[PDB]
Amino acid sequence: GLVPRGSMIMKDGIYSIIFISNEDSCGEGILIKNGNMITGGDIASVYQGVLSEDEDIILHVHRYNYEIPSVLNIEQDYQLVIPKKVLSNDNNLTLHCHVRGNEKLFVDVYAKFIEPLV
Amino acid sequence: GLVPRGSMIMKDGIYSIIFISNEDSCGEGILIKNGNMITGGDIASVYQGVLSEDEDIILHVHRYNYEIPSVLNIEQDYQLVIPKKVLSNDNNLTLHCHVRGNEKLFVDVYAKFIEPLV
Ligand SMILES: CCCCCC(=O)OC[C@H](O)COP(=O)(O)O
Ligand SMILES: CCCCCC(=O)OC[C@H](O)COP(=O)(O)O
């Protein structure tokens, strides 16, 4: 069962990810966590961010394929605020991320651990 | 124009990737390069490997979603041999990777630089 935990407790490795926005659009992708470094992406955008802990966790989203819609329909680069706390297991976690400066724009994410780093 | 170069010359960062196997199947995904570390993945599989240089570059492929076909139809984990040399620019590169132990099983990959690491 999931339990409130610091997102920074996440095991290092590669994660599978599924999300849905407030626009009711879905997307899937990959997420990698090293130290505090978080990098990932899908067929249309990529994202990087550093697990804060003393600051708000900002996840920089960069659209690299405009021929494909954005789960948020922003049509440009933007920032997502990553919660300090998350509901998780040793291999699972979910979180609600909203666009920085507009909590009406968000995505609910489910992350599944796939394997550790080499 | 592309020119033969050591795959280890690749700039660090996140790359967009497109590939086609000998089975004539296509796939797209993301690839990250740090030091010699290479991690990436798509909607059905993920991959890790360390840029060799003194050894054969082995790229460990792990299927994490069997509900989706594999560009190679292997139906399990396997290894790809990454060439020491690659045709590339500062933001582009292509390579031919075959399954370790069977050069008849391969994928031709095109990688496009998206952005550097934070
Ligand atoms: C560390 C937790 C992962 C944060 C979630 C995340 O980065 O999701 C990607 C986001 O949905 C990308 O949306 P877009 O492709 O519509 O721009
Ligand atoms: C460093 C250069 C990238 C190597 C190419 C690569 O890892 O491709 C992924 C491969 O096509 C995955 O195939 P699969 O999803 O059918 O198992």
Side-chain angles (χ1 to χ4, degrees), chain B residues 13-24:
Chain B
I14 310 177
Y15 293 73
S16 178
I17 252 176
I18 304 176
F19 49 75
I20 183 174
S21 66
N22 61 288
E23 261 70 60
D24 184 52

Side-chain angles (χ1 to χ4, degrees), chain A residues 1-51 53 55-103 105-118:
Chain A
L2 280 51
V3 298
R5 296 165 66 176
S7 60
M8 198 168 293
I9 250 58
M10 290 176 75
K11 308 184 301 187
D12 290 349
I14 310 176
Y15 294 72
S16 177
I17 251 174
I18 303 177
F19 49 75
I20 184 173
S21 66
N22 61 288
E23 261 70 59
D24 185 52
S25 284
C26 298
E28 300 186 77
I30 238 62
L31 220 202
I32 292 77
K33 170 179 184 297
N34 212 309
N36 291 302
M37 278 188 80
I38 279 190
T39 52
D42 50 43
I43 41 67
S45 308
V46 296
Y47 17 85
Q48 286 179 282
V50 184
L51 261 34
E53 183 61 64
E55 296 178 58
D56 296 56
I57 305 178
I58 294 295
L59 194 286
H60 296 278
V61 174
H62 170 281
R63 181 73 157 297
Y64 74 82
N65 190 338
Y66 291 77
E67 298 186 303
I68 295 177
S70 165
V71 76
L72 293 178
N73 293 309
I74 295 183
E75 250 49 290
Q76 67 181 58
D77 282 38
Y78 63 95
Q79 285 163 40
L80 284 178
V81 177
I82 304 301
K84 186 178 182 60
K85 292 288 185 173
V86 164
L87 297 170
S88 59
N89 286 308
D90 296 304
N91 300 303
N92 301 288
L93 71 166
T94 60
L95 40 64
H96 177 277
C97 313
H98 69 278
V99 170
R100 183 181 191 177
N102 187 322
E103 301 204 56
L105 267 43
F106 58 87
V107 300
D108 289 307
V109 182
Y110 165 60
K112 188 175 187 301
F113 183 83
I114 299 179
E115 59 173 47
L117 303 182
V118 178

